[PDB]
Ligand binder design. Structure first.
Ligand code: BEF
Ligand code: BEF
Ligand SMILES: [Mg+2]
Ligand SMILES: [Mg+2]
Lengths: 121, 121
């Protein structure tokens, strides 16, 4: 199972769509509280997290920290157009499996998801 | 005890100089085989690694892999002007403690060195 967290509908749909077409059951969330509620209901096997979450209680990096604190075993991959070297290093040090830069190619998204799912329940 | 690995003398001198002035015993190496020889002789407490090592048998990332294989406990920090998000993510996933972008400020270098030395022998 994959949970995609992004404040933009077009990105949630584009990511869930690409992954669903490859045979992965994908759910979406639009902010930190909808993401945490979706994980607390039934933990997915992988989480894709945006960083700049407009109107969210937590940005994607604080959300990564909260997810990794409750579920250290749950792989989390960042997907963001707001990265730089310092931000990507911070994400990996804080527990993210990988960092996908926006704009991404479909095969890169699938390659990373399947690598992370090999490291999941 | 810090080992600085860079193919450029001006960078080896600039990094060893800044760290020596703060009271850290620093040694230098110019390529993968001089770095591995220095480590095998006596393991340092921290290694600073450049990535593009002109004339070296291994680039800095392959050298990071070799160092982390023999000494998983030895902190390694990348210092490079050849980084990007994918390269920095790769370095942290492969065991680097942190990634310092060139050009760097002296206080950033010292801060990162002292954080990594807190995690060393
Ligand atoms: F809004 Be995300 F960090 F691309
Ligand atoms: F030659 Be290094 F990667 F700045
Ligand atoms: Mg966003
Ligand atoms: Mg170089």
């Amino acid at each position: 199972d994959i949970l995609v967290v992004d404040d933009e509908v077009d990105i949630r749909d584009l990511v869930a769509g690409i992954l669903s077409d490859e045979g992965h059951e994908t759910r979406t969330a639009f902010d930190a509280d909808s993401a945490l509620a979706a994980i607390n209901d039934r933990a997915p096997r992988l989480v894709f997290l945006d960083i700049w979450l407009q109107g969210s209680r937590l940005d994607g990096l604080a959300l990564l920290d909260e997810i990794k604190k409750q579920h250290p075993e749950l792989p989390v991959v960042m997907i963001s157009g707001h990265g730089n070297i310092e931000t990507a290093v911070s994400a990996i040090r804080r527990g993210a499996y990988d960092f996908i830069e926006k704009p991404f190619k479909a095969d890169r998204l699938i390659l990373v998801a399947e690598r992370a799912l090999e490291t999941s329940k």
